[PDB]
Amino acid sequence: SGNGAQGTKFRISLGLPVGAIMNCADNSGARNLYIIAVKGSGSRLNRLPAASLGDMVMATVKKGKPELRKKVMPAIVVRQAKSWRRRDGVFLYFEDNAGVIANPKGEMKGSAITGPVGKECADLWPRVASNSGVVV
Amino acid sequence: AKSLRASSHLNAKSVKRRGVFQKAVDAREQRISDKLKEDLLKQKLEDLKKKEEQGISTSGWRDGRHHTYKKAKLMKQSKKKTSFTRF
Amino acid sequence: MGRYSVKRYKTKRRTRDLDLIYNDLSTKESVQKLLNQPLDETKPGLGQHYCIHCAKYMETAIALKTHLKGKVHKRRVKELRGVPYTQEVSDAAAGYNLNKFLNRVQEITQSVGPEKESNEALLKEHLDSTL
Amino acid sequence: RDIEAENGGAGVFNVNLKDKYLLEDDEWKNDIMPEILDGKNVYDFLDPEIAAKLQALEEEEEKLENEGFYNEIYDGFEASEVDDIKEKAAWIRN
Amino acid sequence: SHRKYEAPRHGHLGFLPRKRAASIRARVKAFPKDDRSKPVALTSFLGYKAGMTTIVRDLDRPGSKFHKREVVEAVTVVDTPPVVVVGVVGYVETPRGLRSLTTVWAEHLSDEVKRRFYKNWYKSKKKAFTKYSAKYAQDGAGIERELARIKKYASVVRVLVHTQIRKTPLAQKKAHLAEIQLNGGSISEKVDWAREHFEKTVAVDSVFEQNEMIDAIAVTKGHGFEGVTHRWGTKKLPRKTHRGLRKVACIGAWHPAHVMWSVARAGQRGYHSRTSINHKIYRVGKGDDEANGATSFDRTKKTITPMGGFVHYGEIKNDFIMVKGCIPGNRKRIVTLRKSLYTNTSRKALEEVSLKWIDTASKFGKGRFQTPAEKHAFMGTLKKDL
Amino acid sequence: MRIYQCHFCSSPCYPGHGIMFVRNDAKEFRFCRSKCHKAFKQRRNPRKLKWTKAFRKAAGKELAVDSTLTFAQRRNVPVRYNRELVATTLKAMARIEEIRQKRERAFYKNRMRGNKEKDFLRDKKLVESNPELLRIREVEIARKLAKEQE
RNA sequence: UGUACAACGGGGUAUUGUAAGCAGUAGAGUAGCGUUACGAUCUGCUGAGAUUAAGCCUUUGUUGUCUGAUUUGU
RNA sequence: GAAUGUUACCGCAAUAGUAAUUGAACUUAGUACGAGAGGAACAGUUCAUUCGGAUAAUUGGUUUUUGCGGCUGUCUGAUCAGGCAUUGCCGCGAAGCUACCAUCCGCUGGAUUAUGGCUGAACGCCUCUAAGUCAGAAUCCAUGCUAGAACGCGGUGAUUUC
RNA sequence: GUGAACAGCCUCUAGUUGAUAGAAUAAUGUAGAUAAGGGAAGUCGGCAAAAUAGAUCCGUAACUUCGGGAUAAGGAUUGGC
Ligand SMILES: [Mg+2]
Ligand SMILES: [Mg+2]
Ligand SMILES: [Mg+2]
Ligand SMILES: [Mg+2]
Ligand SMILES: [Mg+2]
Ligand SMILES: [Mg+2]
Ligand SMILES: [Mg+2]
Ligand SMILES: [Mg+2]
Ligand SMILES: [Mg+2]
Ligand SMILES: [Mg+2]
Ligand SMILES: [Mg+2]
Ligand SMILES: [Zn+2]
Ligand SMILES: [Zn+2]
Secondary structure (H helix, E strand, C coil): CCCCCCCCCCCCCEEEEEEEEEECCCCCCCCCEEEEECCCCCCCCCCCCCCCCCCCEEEEECCCCCCCCEEEEEEEECCCCCCCCCCCEEEECCCEEEEEEEECCCCCCCEEEEECCHHHHHHCCCHHHEEECCCC | CCCCCHHHHHHHHHHHHHHHHHHHHHHHHHHHHHHHHHHHHHHHHHHHHHHHHHCCCCCCCHHHHHHHHHHHHHHHHHHHHCCCCCC | CCCCHHHCCEEEEEEECCCHHHHHHHCCHHHHHHHHHCCCCCCHHHHCCEEEECEEEEECHHHHHHHHCHHHHHHHHHHHHCCCHHHHHHHHHCCCCCCHHHHHHHHHHHHHHHHHHHHHHHHHHHHHCCC | CCHHHHHHHCCCCCCHHHHHHHHHHHCCCCCCCCCCEEEEEECCCCCHHHHHHHHHHHHHHHHHHHHCCCCCCCCCHHHHHHHHHHHHHHHCCC | CCCCCCCCCCCCCHHCCCCCCCCCCCCCCCCCCCCCCCCCCCCCCEEEEEEEECCCCCCCCCCCCCCCCCEEEEEEEECCEEEEEEEEEEEECCCCCEEEEEEHHHHHHCHHHHHHHCCCCCCCCCCCCCCHHHHHHHHHHHHHHHHHHHHHCCCEEEEEEEEEEEEEHCCCCCEEEEEEEEEEEEEEEHHHHHHHHHCCCHHHCCCCCCCCEEEEEECCCCEEECCCCHHHHCCCCCCCCCCCCCCCCCCCCCCCCCCCCCCCCCCCCCCCCEEEEEEEEEECCCCCCCCCCCCCCEECCCCCCCCEECCEEEEECCCCEEEECCCCCCCCCEEEECCCCHHHHHHHHHHCCEEEEEECCCCCCCCCCHHHHHHHHHHHHCCCCC | CEEEEEECCCCCCCCCCCCCCCCCCCCCCEEECCHHHHHHHHHCCCCCCCCCCCHHHHCCCCCCCCHCCCCCCCCCCCCCHHHHHHHHHHHHHHHHHHHHHHHHHEEEEHHCCHHHHHHHHHHHHHHHCCCCHHHHHHHHHHHHHHHHHH
């Protein structure tokens, strides 16, 4: 379930297939992230790899700093607009899809995250929880 | 990964199975048997309360009907030559 | 369910909420910040000509003036009049945190309300003078 | 960890969190706290001196009952006459 | 030549043929292994599937992310009134398998189980077992001889029971009759148990208890004739493909000059016999309990029946079994509940279930209230109430 | 485990029911039904939709301020568990609900007084304004009574 | 010829969103002489009114129905 | 689906098919090992990938329920109540169907391969092999699952008054 | 009548009510629709659908044979009383 993730992950509804564009919620200068791959994705004919909340993806920066663009970096999904079920008994969703730029060990490039962060992602990644100001 | 038919996993499963899982199964079986006996006793008590207001050789053939039917069947099989064991 | 409502009120095409706009209009500092915006190349009109009530950018001051002389803007202004209807109102209607709802209502009636009205009046006269 | 290892081990031992409760009575540690009652949450009704508050409510209710909070003929008309009027109006509407 | 990209085949070849089941009551193909040391016990039970609802469970599972937390789970309700013991069958072992040697019936049978022997009950003279009942006279010779034969020769003992379908809300009056294997002491002990239990009822809590894993055996819901796309899960062909897109494009391109049995074809979907295993019993509810839908956390005096009743079924007025998840079959279908064939070695088989809440909102719509009293309390006074 | 109130219509939201939406300012919006959720997405006004508790309270259809309505509020300062306090709370909740129902009934009766007077005046005016149909009614009743007599 | 069956009716359970009719002093104004006339709309009677098995649950009510044809033997 | 007296209920199982798969996590443990840098596994536990079989409590989708409400144009003198617009259009919408867009479930006995052995000749040494024999792979045959020979079978009930 | 309009839709005069029918509502079709999240990852190829659309006002680039391009583009609005 990825390197740097703390523990196991239970299944979440998949919202972001390959080719999706999500907002960047950190302060590293990127404006949006373009998903090109999903870490830990399965193998099945014709099936697109898809990401969910708390998943690590490989993303290129489409809008942002010119020095920041034209390279592939790991990212962690912190918000999705597709509704998913919490085991406490409610389906819930956010307004947008959003992620943060991280390293293969799961450490944030930026120093803070703007906007709410999903509880699943915050509990899975200790550095996201350290940099998060709003957790749900 | 180790398959469902993996020998060492099955051996470890048997070692675990002989212990607490079998003990819990035995305790549940004893409780269920006690409840079944209680249910039979309660039905007996209700039947007694209802009646308060109101008040070996196994050889040979089973019966004559069975004797007649089986003898006719064997005679028919012999006549039509459709027997499995007898020429 | 139908296509018109689906493609207007998709989650990715959502607009700013009325209680957020009311909070923006309540304080004079927020109104000043929204009137004096930094130049953004990604916004219509370089981030200028922003209607606070409708939370909408215009490409030009003449477009902002035509928007102000319209029924859609009047509809939003009429919507932004009374209590903002937060979750406390629904809780009080169900019978939950009634005293908190009453305190919020009297605070809106006494302090937040007239200040927001005066800020709206100053914004209206500023827009009329500059446009 | 010694208790866990002697009982079940890691991932098998089920610790009782209520053993550390500092209550008035130790018999209350293994008590199930109710949460729902007839569509209401118990926790937002739970409060000390709720007995005194309910007593004040009961006094107010008795005052209302004494005041009379919970408790066919018109000017120039009798009961039979108004029944006849109602019956004829129902006939006319039908 | 070889296929360029590997992919698993569509469908399971072990569930063939996908034909309609022979009977609406699914057959029990295997019973648990008999242990002669254990006391006498039934190996299965009969119920009627009523519907599904929702629970909240306080989870105690060490090592889990949801340890010491609440989870919302779906459960299935099976109406299980007591069954009636009406017969016993003895089975001997032969080089050709198990063979039934003889069957002994009880003296008195009810009309519920007599209707199982008739296609036209209202026109019949109702003569079934009327001469068999005469063999119980003058000390029951014949009956005793057949019981002695079962004691002497049988290696397997099964008890014939029938459902009390009059206690359910079902419109059907004909009862269901089935064989349940007896696992317990010696053959003589099994025969004595069956004889003493003739014309007696067995309740579901004298077969199962809470926190036990059971198996559900039933015929699935029928769907009629179906195309390959939904029968086997094949991919749809592109838009406006000639002769249809809900097909397999090429059913054969290779030498055998036949259609292979392993190629997806259109046909019957549903109404198949299925046996699913390891369903945990969440509650064994008693029908005479006024609050069998209440928990220690939820103090509302209510039964298991939702507002308006179960859709297409009705109320639950008897004992019931609440198991988690889903089981094959649809509402009001007869189901067989079987004991586990092995000693399960998972911790979920040893977990103790504590329920915090049981959903009783209406299943006939977006139900918002658990009780009619709650609905009246929320809405207030209506025009017709004054 | 908790019963929530719908953001749109104040109906109870039981576990596993409805849907929640989280905004950018960490505000949760719970809806008991897809109906309320879609109304919120369309940005309709629950104080303008008549089937909502917000509208009913605003318009005075049911009582909104009472002593029995001040016993429920969010408790942000917990108290230590006490068995007798729990029992007292469990009895008090039933008593409070019974009293609140009595007062709601009284409020509705006070709101609906005068309907009998209005209906009687309408019936009297109709009877005064329709003389010919009353004559037809009298003829029909007299013929029926004659038929019963003979 | 009955915990009989059916067609209606009743009660629940749901869906929508406040029926027709009447009234008001609420209604931007305008016209004639404070009043009257017109007036989108608003408010009250009114969670009203309508629908609810056709594959929902239930039923002390009303009205009826219970019958023809074919074949089968060791 | 005819036929072997008729009719009904409960069963047996020849044969045919067969199904599960992979990764990660806690603990073992910063332990064995190691100047260091680094760093395992068995036993005990928890999730997930792919596949398969179901299921509709909840969420989402779907609407001729033409169920409720609304809109444009026209028509029935107006109100009311309605017609038509090739399902007129818009919002909600039960029931049903359905989704890795929802939820649940998917095992355990014998015999073996490579290989490691025991006893032991051939060959007065020796040798796992010659006779004999112990273990051992996701393998094989079974257990379990699906169908049930329409010319395989058993047990049991009733068997006609013109 | 609506409407710029011999457009589309509804109606009066006049004229038709013709085209084998009945019962059910499986698969596959022919014709027509809707769909969460993503948005061409599909495909040889955005094929097909979707999106745009009337009218009023603001505004409108390169190039040019100076006539055009042009409804360029891009914006604000529309009911009733
Ligand atoms: Mg492909
Ligand atoms: Mg499926
Ligand atoms: Mg339902
Ligand atoms: Mg291990
Ligand atoms: Mg019209
Ligand atoms: Mg040797
Ligand atoms: Mg056969
Ligand atoms: Mg879509
Ligand atoms: Mg491509
Ligand atoms: Mg491709
Ligand atoms: Mg051009
Ligand atoms: Zn505006
Ligand atoms: Zn709601």
